[PDB]
Curated annotation (Swiss-Prot), chain A:
Subunit of the fusion protein that is processed upon entry into the host cell. Mediates fusion of the virion and cellular membranes by functioning as a class I viral fusion protein. Contains a viral fusion peptide that is unmasked after S2 cleavage. This cleavage can occur at the cell membrane by host TMPRSS2 or during endocytosis by host CSTL. In either case, this triggers an extensive and irreversible conformational change that leads to fusion of the viral envelope with the cellular cytoplasmic membrane, releasing viral genomic RNA into the host cell cytoplasm. The gene is S. This is Spike protein S2'. Changing residue 3 to N: In strain: Delta/B.1.617.2, Mu/B.1.621. Changing residue 22 to K: In strain: Omicron/BA.1, Omicron/BA.2, Omicron/BA.2.12.1, Omicron/BA.2.75, Omicron/BA.4, Omicron/BA.5, Omicron/BQ.1.1, Omicron/XBB.1.5, Omicron/EG.5.1. Residues 2-46 form a coiled coil.
From Swiss-Prot, chain C:
The chain holds residues 350 to 399 of 1273 of the full protein. Changing residue 24 to P: In strain: Omicron/BA.1, Omicron/BA.2, Omicron/BA.2.12.1, Omicron/BA.2.75, Omicron/BA.4, Omicron/BA.5, Omicron/BQ.1.1, Omicron/XBB.1.5, Omicron/EG.5.1. Changing residue 22 to F: In strain: Omicron/BA.2, Omicron/BA.2.12.1, Omicron/BA.2.75, Omicron/BA.4, Omicron/BA.5, Omicron/BQ.1.1, Omicron/XBB.1.5, Omicron/EG.5.1. This is Spike protein S1. It comes from the Viruses. It comes from Severe acute respiratory syndrome coronavirus 2. Binds to host ACE2. RBD also interacts with the N-linked glycan on 'Asn-90' of ACE2. Cleavage of S generates a polybasic C-terminal sequence on S1 that binds to host Neuropilin-1 (NRP1) and Neuropilin-2 (NRP2) receptors. Interacts with host integrin alpha-5/beta-1 (ITGA5:ITGB1) and with ACE2 in complex with integrin alpha-5/beta-1 (ITGA5:ITGB1). May interact via cytoplasmic c-terminus with M protein. May interact (via N-terminus) with host bilirubin and biliverdin, thereby preventing antibody binding to the SARS-CoV-2 spike NTD via an allosteric mechanism. The gene is S. Attaches the virion to the cell membrane by interacting with host receptor, initiating the infection. The major receptor is host ACE2. When S2/S2' has been cleaved, binding to the receptor triggers direct fusion at the cell membrane. When S2/S2' has not been cleaved, binding to the receptor results in internalization of the virus by endocytosis using host TFRC and GRM2 and leading to fusion of the virion membrane with the host endosomal membrane. Alternatively, may use NRP1/NRP2 and integrin as entry receptors.
Amino acid sequence: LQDVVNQNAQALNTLVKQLSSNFGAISSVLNDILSRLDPPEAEVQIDRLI
Amino acid sequence: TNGVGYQPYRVVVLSFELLHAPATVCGPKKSTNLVKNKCVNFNFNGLTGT
Amino acid sequence: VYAWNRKRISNCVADYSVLYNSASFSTFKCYGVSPTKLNDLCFTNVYADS
């Protein structure tokens, strides 16, 4: 019974932690990319994040 | 007498670290009063969020 | 050229808008940030090389 709970918690945790990866962009924070960069260039980073 | 190619140019370059440390140089902005117990969008020294 | 006086701009309210608005500067090229949004951001560790 504990294995199911542990597996689900671990999968959910890694899903959460995958939000902290750049994926080749300039940052992992989308608001930071928007605030620091103009709309024409922001799409390039946003596409990698997507 | 030298042309613009060899005319001296004066260059100043700025290097900006934007990692969320105790930031000390900010842009000109007005610090309003804070509110509590309401979902608001905030900006604490560049730490934007909702 | 071989030397450069690096200057520490810290602990002050940089305006950043008086620059890039005058035509005295021949080139205003920025890479990490879009020049027009240098006002909302608050920066850390400004390096100036002349």
